Amino acid sequence: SMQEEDTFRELRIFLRNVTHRLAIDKRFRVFTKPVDPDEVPDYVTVIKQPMDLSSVISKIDLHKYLTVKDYLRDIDLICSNALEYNPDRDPGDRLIRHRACALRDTAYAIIKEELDEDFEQLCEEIQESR
Ligand SMILES: Cc1cc2ccnc(NC3CCNCC3)c2[nH]c1=O
């Protein structure tokens, strides 16, 4: 219906805004674009579902997220990919893991503050009805 289309449009607007605020944070530059195959060739073989904030924006615009829960699965994916691929004690690995956890925590915190629970509940109920 028109009302449901409006609901999903508001969701997309909300998610673009959250995603932009993560994307402009200097700490998260490493998560803004797909990993460069030239810089690292073995990433595609180790990480089976690469995810990044530009890909999240593309998915928002393709109507791939019908709930904030589904959006957060991809934010969690960016984080878990980073923890999996960079597990070592070296400072490069520890820096990226700290940033990955910070990205995750920041997204959840923005959502906890600015997502209305009844809005999310509506989204989930429309999704489940389809
Ligand atoms: C997303 C991403 C980017 C990246 C860039 C450069 N290096 C990485 N890993 C190194 C592995 C060896 N230790 C230093 C860090 C990257 N890892 C990523 O997950």
UniProtKB/Swiss-Prot annotation:
Inducing stimuli: Up-regulated in breast, uterus, colon, ovary, and stomach tumors. Induced in breast cancer cells overexpressing NCOA3 or treated with estrogen. Down-regulated in 5-fluorouracil-resistant derivatives of the colon cancer cell line HCT 116.
Top-level division of the source organism's lineage: Eukaryota
Tissue spec: Highly expressed in estrogen receptor positive breast tumors and in osteosarcoma tumors.
Coiled-coil stretches noted in the UniProt entry, renumbered to this chain: 108-130
Subcellular location: Nucleus
Residue intervals of the Bromo domain: 3-114
Subunit structure: Interacts with ESR1 and NCOA3 and these interactions are enhanced by estradiol. Interacts with acetylated lysine residues on histone H1.4, H2A, H2B and H3 (in vitro).
Family note: Belongs to the AAA ATPase family.
Function: May be a transcriptional coactivator of the nuclear receptor ESR1 required to induce the expression of a subset of estradiol target genes, such as CCND1, MYC and E2F1. May play a role in the recruitment or occupancy of CREBBP at some ESR1 target gene promoters. May be required for histone hyperacetylation. Involved in the estrogen-induced cell proliferation and cell cycle progression of breast cancer cells.
Protein name as catalogued: ATPase family AAA domain-containing protein 2
The encoding gene: ATAD2
Residues of the full protein shown: 981 to 1108 of 1390
